[PDB]
Symmetry: D2
Subunit: 430 residues, 4 copies
C-alpha cells in the first residue's frame, strides 16, 4: 500500500514531456511564479495533496509547486479527465501520482487516499478542484485536520460546501476561495468555455455550426462565452434564463431570450450552462428537430435528463466514443454528447493552456498565502487579495504583448490610488 | 426671489409635451413605477430637490416622482445639457424648474438654490447627479441638513465625495450609491455610451468610421461600450490602460493595447473614457495624423489638454457649434469636438430613453427607500438591495419581449435560492 | 434665360468653402485624380452636364473635373438632396450651378435644362445619377445627341434604362455603367448605407437600437450593410428575401430569414432595402407593435405603402421635419420616416465623404475614358476596365494607411498575372 | 488488373455506413437530387470516372449519381484525404473504388487508371477535382476522348488548365466550370475554410486563439473566411494583399493590412490563403516570435518555404502526426502544421457535410446537363446556368428552416423578372 505512483503506462513520459514543453510557453503565470519564487522556495515544508484533473496543464502546475520547493502527491479529481502521457511525465519526474483514464469509483477513492500520506507524515496543505479531497479528509481522516494548514478551492460546488461546513462549525481549516478572483472566474468560466465549446462539438459531430439555431440555457459566465462562441460561427443563439439581470444582458447583445419549452422546438444544437438540474426533459426531446445535438458544459450530467432517453428511446446506437444517437418513438434522432457530462472535457482537450495558466497561478498564490501567512487566515473561507489578482493578470500581458500604461504621481494622486496599488474597489465587476 | 420657475421659453411646452409622450413608451421602468405606486403615493410629504441634466428623460423622471406623490423642484446639473422644450413642458405642468440652455456660472448656482425652498419649508430629500446639490447645501445651508432624510447619488465623482465627507465625519445625511446597481452601472456606463458615442461623432463630423484607426483610452465600462461601438462600424480600435485586468480583458477581444504615446501616431479618431487627467497632451497632438478627430466622453474636459491647443496652435477655426479645427505648427489640422467636454452630451442628445429608464428607475427606488425606510439607512453611503436591482431589470424585459424562465421548487431548492428571491451573490460581477 | 447660376443664397459660400476643405481630406481618390491629371488637363474641350445630388462631396467632384480642365454645368438630380452652402461655394467659384433645397417639379426640370448649353455650344458629355439628364435630352433635345460623346450612369435605374434604350435602338450615345465597378458598387451600396442607416434613424427618432428586433427586407448589398449596421448596435435582425442565394447568405451569418408577413409581428424597426414595390402594406402595419419605426433606404418611396397610411390612419401627427407618427384604428402608433423616401438622404447627410470619394473617382475615370478613348466605346453601355477599378482602390489605401504587398517576378509568373496588371478574372465576385 | 475495388480494409464498411447515415441528414442538396431524379434515372448510360478526395461526403455524392442511375468508378484525387471507412462502405456497396490513406505516387496514378474502364467499355463522363483525371486521359488515353461526353471541374487549378488546353486547341471535350457557381464558390471557399480553419489548428496545437495576433496572407474568399473565423475567437488579425480592392475590403472590416515582411514580426499564428508561392520565407521565419504556429490552407505546400526550414533549422522534432517543431539558430521554435500542406484537410476532417452538400449538388447538376444536353455544350468550358445555382441554394433553405418570400405578379412585373426565374444579372457579385 506504499506505491510511489500509479499511472496507466510509465512509457508515455517521453511524449508527455514533449507536451509540457510546448505548454509551458503558453502558461506565463506559472512560469513567472517559477522565476519569482524558485529561489525563495516559499513552499518548503509544505506537503500538498493535489486533486485536480490530471492533464498537461496541471502537470505544469505540479512542477511549479515543486519548483517553489514543496512536496506534492496528486490524484485526478475526475475519472476521465486524466491524460496518461501527462501523468506519465509527472511519474517519471519522481512525483507521486495516482491518475489514469477511466478509473473505477473504488479506484478513484483509492487514488485520492494515496496522496494523503508522505514519508515525513501526512499532508499539511490541500489543493482542491471540487472538494473531494477536502470532504474525504474531513469525514474519514479527522486526525490529520489539526495538521493541515490550508485549503484552496476553485470550484463553485467545492467553495459552497466550504461555506456550509464553516457555517455549521465543521470546517476545521482556513480555505481560500480562489474561484472568485477575476482572472480565475473569467478565464475558467468565460474564456475557457468559449474557446472549447465548439471544439468539443466539432470533434464529436464535425457538424457545421453556421446557419444553425443553437439554444443555450443559462447566461452566466460560461453561458456568455458559449453564446459568443456559437455566434462567432454564424449560428443564431437563443437563451433561456431565470435571472432577470442576465436575461437583460443577453437581450442587449442581440440574442433572443425565451423558455426551453418554446425553444426546444427551434433548436438545432443545445448547450446547457447551469449548475441547475432538469433543464432539458422528455417533453423537450419529443419536440426537438430531427438529429438535434444535445450536450452539456455545465458541471454535472445533471442538466440533461439522460435517463429519460435511455428509457423512452427505441434504439440507442453508439456512433463513436462519447457520441451516441437515440431514436425516438416519433422518428426523430437525438445526438447526445459526452453521455451528458462536460462536453469540453469529454470531447475536447478541455480548456487551453493559457487560460489554465491564469486560474492556476491563482492556485499557486493561494498556497503561498495560506502556508506563509497562516496568521492572516483564521478558519473560514477567504478571498485572494485584489492586488494579487492584478498580479496574475500583469504576468500574462507579456505573452500577448500589451503595453500597460503606468499611472503618474499627479494622476495617481488625482485618482486617489497607489501608482502600483489596487486600481479598483472590491465591489468592482469588470 | 420667489419665482415659480425659470425656463428659456414657456411656449416650447406644446412640443416638449410631444416628446415626453414618445419618450414614455421607451421608459418602462419609470412607467411601471407610476403604475405600482401612483396609488400608494409612497413619496407623500417628500420635498425632492433634483439636480440632473434637464432633458426629456429627466422630465419623465420628474413627473414620475410627482405621480408617486411628492413635491419636486428641479435644476439641471449642467449648463448646456438642458433641453428648453423639455423644461418648457415641466414648467407648464406647474412644476418649479430653473433650467435653460447655456446659463452662466452665477445663473447655475442661482438655479440650484431655487430648489432649496418649498412653500412648506425647505427640502427633505436630495436627488443628485454630481453632488453639486449635495455640496452646496452641506457648506452653505447646514441648517437644512437636520431636515433632509436622504441623498441619492448616481455619479462616480458624486459618490466618491460622499464616501469622503462620511469618512471625515462631514456627511450628515444617509445616501444611497445608486450608481453601483448593475442595471444602472451597465446602462449609464456601457450601453449608454455605446449607443451614443458615434452619434455625437457623426453629427459633429459626419465622418466615416469604418476603415479608420480609433484609439480609446480606458477599457472600463464606458471604454468597453465605445470600443464595441467603433468596432461594429469597421474601425480598428486600439486601447490604452493602466489596469492589467481590463487590459487583459481587451486583448481577449482582439483589440490591441498599447500606450497613448505609441498610439497617438496611428490613431484617426481618439476617444478618452477615463476619470483621469492628462490623457492626451501636446506631445501626442504633434504626432497625430492630419485631421485627427479628438473628443472625450469621460466626465470632464480634464482628459484632453485643450489649453495646449489654444496655446501652441497657429489658428483655431470654428467649423460649427461644438466643432473646432486647430492648425498646428507642422501642417496638420486637429478637429476637436465639444471643446473637450462630453461629446455625447455636447454633440448628441445624450443617451437613449430606454437606457435612461434603467438608471432612473434605480433613482426612483432610492427615493422610496430612503424616505420610507429611514430606519434602515443610518448616515452613510448605502447600496440598493439586489432584489431591487433585478426589479429594475424585470421591468424592462417587457418592452423588448423576452420570456423569463421561472425557477421551480425542486430547482430553486437544488440551487438553494428563493424562486423569486435574489438569484446571485453580492460579489457577483455579471 | 441665360443666368450664370441659381442657388438658394450666394452668401453661404464662405461656409460651403469651409466644408469643401475638411471634406477634401476625406476624398483621396478625387484629390489624386487632381494630382495625376491637373497638368494634363485630359478633359479639355469637354463640356460636362452634371446631374447629381448637389452636396459637399459632389462639389469636390465638380471642382475635380474642372481641375482636369473641363467646362461643367450642374443641377442636382434630387429636389431635396441639395446642400445650399455646398452649391453656394461652387457658384462663387464661377461655376454654373442650378441647385437649391426643395425646388418644384417645374423648377427641377428647369434646373437640368440650364446645364444643356454652354457659351461655345451645347454639352458633349453627360454625368448622370438617375438618367434624368439622359432621358430629358434623348426625348426633348435629340439635336444635341450627335454632339454628345458619352454618358456615365451610376444608378441601377439609370443603368437599366440605358440597357433598354440600347436594346430598342434608342440609345444614341455610348455609356459606361460606372455602377458595376467593385469600388463603386460596394461603397455606394454596402459601406455607404451601413455607415448612415442608423445615423438617419438616430437623428430622426434618437431611439435606442440595442435590444430591438429590426426587420430588414432584402439581403442585397444595401441590405447586407444595414443588417450588419443594426447588428453591431445590439438589435436582433430578421431578413426577408426572394433570392435563395442571398437568403442562404443571410442564414449563414446568423440572421433569421422569414416573410414580411410573419416578420411584421415581431419587428420594432423596419428598413426596406429593395428596388421592389409593396414590401410593407396595410396588412403589415395593422400587425406592427406600438410605436414601430418604419423607414426605407431602397431607392424610391415605392417600397412602403405610405398612401395606405394617409388613408386608413385616424390622425397623422408631425413630430418634426421628415418624422411623422400615424395613429391606427387599433391603438398602435407608427413612426414613419422621410415620408417613405430615402432615410439616409432624408434624415442624415447621406453617405460619408470617403465613401463618395470611391464612387466619384470611378465617375471621373469614366469621363476621361469616354472622352479620350471614343474609339474604344461604340454606342452601347460599357463597363470600366478592371485595372482601373483597382486604381480607384489603390488610391484610398493611403488614407487608411495600408501597406499593399507587391507581387514578385517569380510569384507573378507562378500566378500567371502581371505584377501590376489586373489580379483577378472578370467574373470574380470579391 | 481487373479488380472490383481496392480499399484499405473492407471490414470498416459497417462503420462507414454509420457515418453516411448521419452525414446524409446534413446534405439536403444531394438528398433532394435523389428525390427529384431517383425515378427519372437521368444519368442512365453514363459511366462516370470520379476523382475526388474519397471521404464520407463524397460517399454521399457517389451514391447520389448511382441513385440517378449511373455507373461510377472512383479514386481519391489526393493520397491522404481518403477516409478508409468511407471508402469501405462504398466498396461493400458493390461500387468500384480505388482509394485508401497515404498511397504512393505510383499507387495513386494506378488508382485513377482503374476508373477509366467499365465492363461495357471506357468512361463517357469525367468528374474532376483537380484535373488529374482529365490530364491523365487527355495525354495517355487519347483514344477514349471522342468517347467522353463531358468534364465537370471544380478547382481553380483544374478549371484554369481547362481554359488553357481549350485556348491551345487541346481540350477535346466540353467542360463545365462548376467552381464559379455562387453556392459552390462561396461554400467551398468561404464558409468551408471558415468552419474548419481553427478546428485544424485546435486539434493540431490545441492552442488558444484569443489574445493572439494572427497573420493571414490573402483576402480572397478563403482568406476572408479564415479572417472572420480567427476574429470571432478573439485574435487580432492582420492581412496581406496584392489586390488593392481586396485590401480595401479588409480595411473596411477593421483589419490591418500590411506586408508579410513587417507582419512576420508581429504574428503568433500564420495562415496562408493563396494560390501563390513564396509567401513565407526564411527572412520571415527568422523574425517570428518564439513558438509561432505556421500553417497553410491555400492549395499546395507551395506557399510556405518548408524546404528552407528543413535546411536552415538546427533540430526538427515531431510533436505528433502532421505537427512538427523546428528549432532556429536563434533560439525560437516554429510549429509547422500539415508539413505545409492543406491544414484543414491534414489536421481536420476537411469541410463539414452541409457545405460539401452545396458544391457537390453543383457537381451532380453539371453531370446531368453535360450528359443530357450535349447539344447545349460545344467543346469549351461552360458555366452552370444561374437558374440552377439558385436551385442548389433553395434546396438548402429547408435544413436551416428559412422562409423564402415569393415574388408576386405585380412585384415581379415591376421588377421585370420571372416570379421564379433568375432574380439577378449575371455580373451580380452577391
Ligand atoms: N465545463 C467547464 O469547463 C466549466 C468551467 C467553469 C464552470 N463550469 C460550470 O458551469 C456552471 C455554470 O457556471 P457559471 O460561472 O456561468 O455560473 P453562473 O452562476 O454565472 O450562471 C449560471 C446561470 O444559470 C442560470 N440558470 C439557473 N437555473 C436556470 C434554469 N433552470 N434555466 C435557465 N437558466 C438557469 C442563472 O440565472 C445564471 O445566470 C457551473 O455548474 C460551473 O461549475 C464548467
Ligand atoms: N458621458 C457619459 O455619458 C458618461 C456616463 C457614465 C460614466 N461616464 C464617465 O466616464 C468615466 C469612466 O467611467 P467608467 O464607468 O468606465 O469608469 P471605470 O472606473 O470602469 O474605468 C476607467 C478606466 O480607466 C482606466 N484608466 C485610468 N487612467 C488611465 C490612463 N491614464 N490611461 C489609460 N487608461 C486609464 C482605468 O484602468 C479603468 O479601467 C468616468 O469619469 C465616468 O463618470 C460618462
Ligand atoms: N439610399 C442609398 O444610399 C442607396 C445607395 C445604393 C443603392 N440604393 C438602392 O437600394 C436598392 C437595393 O440596392 P442593392 O444594391 O442592395 O440591390 P440588390 O439588387 O443587390 O439587392 C436587392 C435585393 O432585394 C431582394 N428583394 C427583391 N424583392 C424583394 C421582396 N419583395 N421581398 C424581399 N426581398 C426582395 C432581392 O432578392 C435582392 O437580393 C436599389 O433600389 C438601389 O438603387 C440606395
Ligand atoms: N483548403 C481548402 O479547403 C480550399 C477550398 C477552396 C479553395 N482553396 C484554395 O485556396 C487558394 C485561395 O482561394 P480563394 O478562393 O480565396 O482565392 P482568391 O483568388 O479569391 O483570392 C486569393 C487572394 O490572394 C491574394 N494574393 C495573391 N498573391 C498574394 C501575395 N503574394 N501576398 C498577399 N496576397 C496575395 C490575391 O490578391 C487574392 O485576393 C486557392 O489555391 C484555392 O484553390 C482551398
Ligand atoms: N486543460 C485543463 N486542465 C485542468 N483543469 C481543466 C482543464 N480544462 C478545464 N479544466 C477544469 O474543468 C473544471 C470543471 O470540471 C474547471 O474548474 C476547469 O478549471
Ligand atoms: N438623455 C439624458 N438625460 C439625462 N441624463 C443623461 C442623459 N444622457 C446621459 N445622461 C447622464 O450624463 C451623466 C454624465 O454627465 C451620466 O451620469 C448620465 O446618466
Ligand atoms: N453625400 C452624398 N453626395 C452625393 N451623392 C450621395 C451622397 N450620399 C448618397 N448619395 C447617392 O445617393 C444615391 C441614391 O439616391 C446613391 O447612388 C449615392 O451615390
Ligand atoms: N469533406 C470533404 N470531402 C470532399 N472534398 C472536400 C472536403 N473538404 C474539403 N474538400 C475539398 O478540398 C478541395 C481542395 O483540395 C476543395 O475543392 C474542397 O471542395
Amino acid at each position: 500500500d506504499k506505491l510511489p505512483y500509479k499511472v496507466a503506462d510509465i512509457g508515455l513520459a517521453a511524449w508527455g514531456r514533449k507536451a509540457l514543453d510546448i505548454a509551458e510557453n503558453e502558461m506565463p503565470g506559472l512560469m513567472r511564479m517559477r522565476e519569482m519564487y524558485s529561489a525563495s522556495k516559499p513552499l518548503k515544508g509544505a506537503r500538498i495533496a493535489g486533486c485536480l484533473h490530471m492533464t498537461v496543464e496541471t502537470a505544469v502546475l505540479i512542477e511549479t509547486l515543486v519548483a517553489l520547493g514543496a512536496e506534492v502527491r496528486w490524484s485526478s479529481c475526475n475519472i476521465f479527465s486524466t491524460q496518461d502521457h501527462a501523468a506519465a511525465a509527472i511519474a517519471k519526474a519522481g512525483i507521486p501520482v495516482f491518475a489514469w483514464k477511466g478509473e473505477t469509483d473504488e479506484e478513484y477513492l483509492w487514488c485520492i487516499e494515496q496522496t494523503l500520506h508522505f514519508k515525513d507524515g501526512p499532508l499539511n496543505m490541500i489543493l482542491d478542484d471540487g472538494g473531494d479531497l477536502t470532504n474525504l479528509i474531513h469525514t474519514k481522516h479527522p486526525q490529520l485536520l489539526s495538521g493541515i494548514r490550508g485549503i484552496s478551492e476553485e470550484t463553485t460546488t467545492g467553495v459552497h460546501n466550504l461555506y456550509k461546513m464553516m457555517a455549521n462549525g465543521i470546517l476545521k481549516v482556513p480555505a481560500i476561495n480562489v474561484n472568485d478572483s477575476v482572472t480565475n472566474s473569467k478565464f475558467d468560466n468565460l474564456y475557457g468555455c468559449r474557446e472549447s465549446l465548439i471544439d468539443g462539438i466539432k470533434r464529436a459531430t464535425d457538424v457545421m455550426i453556421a446557419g444553425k439555431v443553437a439554444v443555450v440555457a443559462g447566461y452566466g459566465d460560461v453561458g456568455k462565452g458559449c453564446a459568443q462562441a456559437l455566434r462567432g460561427f454564424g449560428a443564431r443563439v437563443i437563451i433561456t434564463e431565470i435571472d432577470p439581470i442576465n436575461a437583460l444582458q443577453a437581450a442587449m447583445e442581440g440574442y433572443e431570450v425565451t423558455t426551453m419549452d418554446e425553444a426546444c422546438k427551434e433548436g438545432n444544437i443545445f448547450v446547457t450552462t447551469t449548475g441547475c438540474v432538469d433543464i432539458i426533459l422528455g417533453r423537450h426531446f419529443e419536440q426537438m428537430k430531427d438529429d438535434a445535438i444535445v450536450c452539456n458544459i455545465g458541471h454535472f450530467d445533471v442538466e440533461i435528463d439522460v435517463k429519460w432517453l435511455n428509457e423512452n428511446a427505441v434504439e440507442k446506437v453508439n456512433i463513436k466514443p462519447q457520441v451516441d444517437r437515440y431514436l425516438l418513438k416519433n422518428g426523430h434522432r437525438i445526438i447526445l454528447l459526452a453521455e451528458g457530462r462536460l462536453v469540453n472535457l469529454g470531447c475536447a482537450m478541455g480548456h487551453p493552456s493559457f487560460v489554465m495558466s491564469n486560474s492556476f497561478t491563482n492556485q499557486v498564490m493561494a498556497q503561498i498565502e495560506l502556508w506563509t501567512h497562516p496568521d492572516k487566515y483564521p478558519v473560514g473561507v477567504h478571498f485572494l487579495p485584489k492586488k494579487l489578482d492584478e498580479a496574475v493578470a500583469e504576468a500574462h500581458l507579456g505573452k500577448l504583448n500589451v503595453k500597460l500604461t503606468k499611472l503618474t504621481e499627479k494622476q495617481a494622486q488625482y485618482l486617489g490610488m497607489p501608482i502600483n496599488g489596487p486600481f479598483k474597489p472590491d465591489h468592482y465587476r469588470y
